[PDB]
Amino acid sequence: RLPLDPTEFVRVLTGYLTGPRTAFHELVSAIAMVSRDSHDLQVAMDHFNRELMDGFSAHAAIISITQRCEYFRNCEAPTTQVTSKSQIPRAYHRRLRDVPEGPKTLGRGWVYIYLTPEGSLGLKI
Numbered sequence: 001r002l003p004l005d006p007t008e009f010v011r012v013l014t015g016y017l018t019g020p021r022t023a024f025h026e027l028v029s030a031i032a033m034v035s036r037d038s039h040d041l042q043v044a045m046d047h048f049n050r051e052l053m054d055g056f057s058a059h060a061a062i063i064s065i066t067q068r069c070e071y072f073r074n075c076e077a078p079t080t081q082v083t084s085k086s087q088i089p090r091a092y093h094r095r096l097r098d099v100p101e102g103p104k105t106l107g108r109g110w111v112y113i114y115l116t117p118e119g120s121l122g123l124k125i
Helices: 006-015 023-034 038-053 058-068 090-095
Strands: 079-081 110-116 119-124
Touching: 006 023, 006 038, 023 058, 023 110, 023 119, 038 058, 090 119
Parallel strands: 079 110
Antiparallel strands: 110 119
């Protein structure tokens, strides 16, 4: 069999989501981006399937990885670079906040630290 890579991880987990793309899709993508190898991805995936088995929704399970899986819990939120604020999805605009110094952890709910030419805007879950 084939161990996981980020792309398949994102496809499997976001399969359980519906509706327009929201910060939950981005949280899935952040979890995939921030893992160090296939082992972290299958930790996150095993936990996700555990939480669905327990009857949690996909959304709850996704947040539950950031809370209960110890690696992702203590992980710096990933950085995305954009040419401007305009290329950040529009629905996120109202929730963007400026970003502190130091640990912008996934456990504390961060998803993306966007990099813009004038500012470093953070998006929470």
